[PDB]
Amino acid sequence: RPMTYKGAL
Amino acid sequence: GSHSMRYFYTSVSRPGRGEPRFISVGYVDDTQFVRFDSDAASPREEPRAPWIEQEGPEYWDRNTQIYKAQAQTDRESLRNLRGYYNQSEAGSHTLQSMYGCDVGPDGRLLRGHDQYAYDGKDYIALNEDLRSWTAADTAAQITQRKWEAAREAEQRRAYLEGECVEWLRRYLENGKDKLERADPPKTHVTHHPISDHEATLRCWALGFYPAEITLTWQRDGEDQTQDTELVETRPAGDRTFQKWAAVVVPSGEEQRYTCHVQHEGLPKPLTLRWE
Amino acid sequence: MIQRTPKIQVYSRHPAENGKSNFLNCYVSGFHPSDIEVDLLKNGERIEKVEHSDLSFSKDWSFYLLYYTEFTPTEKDEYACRVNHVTLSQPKIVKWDRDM
Predict the structure, then answer these.
(1) Bridge partners of residue C51, in order along the sequence
(2) B108: closest CA among B70, B160, B144, B59?
C-alpha cells in the first residue's frame, strides 16, 4: 500500500 | 530472486481546463496491480491484478483517501513550484513522483527510492542513506530546506524500511504463481533479403517475463553493437514482453552471425543462428 | 520548456496468422509531456473503442502507453498507428509490419 502524510514540495 | 514495489504519481496542471489531474499506478516488478484517477467518475483505488482483489474493502477505502490527500498535496506543490521558477499561471506543468523498495530473495531491504521530477527534469531525490536529500537546482534547495526542517526524510525511511517491504512480501506471497514465475523468451531468427548482396537477420524474443532481457548479435564471435538495430522492449498485452535485434549482413555470410539471448527464465544463455 | 518526442511501435500480441484472431498493439513511449493522441487504423479508417493502459513512466521520467484492440489479420487488410504530440507538427503514421 502507498505512503501517506507526505509533505508538499 | 530480487523484487521491487513501485508507485508512480503523475500530476498535470491544466489552466483554463479545471484543477490538476492526479493519477497513480502501483507496480510489483513489471506487474501493475493498482490504479487511481482523479478524473474518473468515482475516484477510487482499483485492482489491476487478480492477486490484489482478495484485499478487503477497508484496504481500498484507506488507499483511496491517501490518494485523494496526495492529490491535494500535489496541487499545493504545483503552486509552490511555479513560484520557485517564477512561472506564470497560464502554462501547464507536470509533477512526477516515484518511490518504493527493493528486496532480495530473503525479503530483506536492498534499496529504497523516493524522488521527484518537474516538467520532465529531475528535481529532488532521497539519497540511498534514506536520511539526506539531493537537490537538482536552487528551486529544489528550497524544498530541501523545508523538508530538512520538518525531518521529512525520517518518515520516508520508516515507510521504505517497514511498511513498504512488509506489504511487498505479502504481495509476493499472494501472487507467487505469477510474481515469482519467470517466463523464458520464445526465440527464432528471420531472414529477409533487402537486395541481392545484402540481407536482414532479425533475432526475436517473445512471451518473456520479466521485461529485463539481453539481445545481442555477434559476427565471428565479436559484438556488433553499433551495427545492430535494437528496438525497445515492448509489452504484448498478456503480461509478457517482446524484443528483437536486427543486423544487415552480406549475402552468403549468414552463418558467421550468431544471436545471443540472456534472461532470468533461462538457466543458460541461448545461441541462435538463421534456420 | 524541454519536450521529448514519442517512440512508436506497432505490432501484434501473437505472431500474425491470417484468419486467426489476434491483438493489434501500438506502444508509445519516451515522450514528454504526457498529453498524447493515438489512433489505430484499419485500411485508413479509425478503429472504434480502442483500449489503452494506465498512464505510467520509466526511470527517465518519460511516459509510456499501450493502445490495443482485437483484430483478425488478413492478406489485403492494412493496419497502422496514428500518433499526435506537441512535438509533432503533423500526425505521424506507422504501418503495421508482420516482422517488426
Answers:
(1) C68
(2) B160
Distance from the Cα of A8 to chain B's closest Cα (Å) equals 5
Residue B137's identity, in one-letter code, is D
Closest by CA position to C26, among listed C77, C71, C87: C71
Identify the helix (H) or strand (E) that includes residue B189: strand B186-193
Chains in contact with chain A (at least 3 beta-carbon pairs closer than 8 A): B
Nearest alpha-carbon partner for C54 in B37, B38, B256, B227: B37
Rg (CA), chain C: 14
Angle among Cα B26, B28, B29 to the nearest 5 degrees reads: 125
Distances (CA, A) of B136 to B83, B123, B124, B144: 16, 5, 6, 10
Letter for the amino acid at B218? Q
| Domains, chain C, ordered by start | 1-100 (2.60.40.10)
Q: Are A8 and B73 in contact (CB under 8 A)?
A: yes
CATH number of B182-272: 2.60.40.10
User: Which technique was the structure solved with, according to the deposited record?
Assistant: X-ray
Å resolution of this model? 1.9
**C56 contacts on B by Cβ (under 8 Å):** 8, 25, 27, 32
| CATH classification (class only), B1-181 | alpha beta
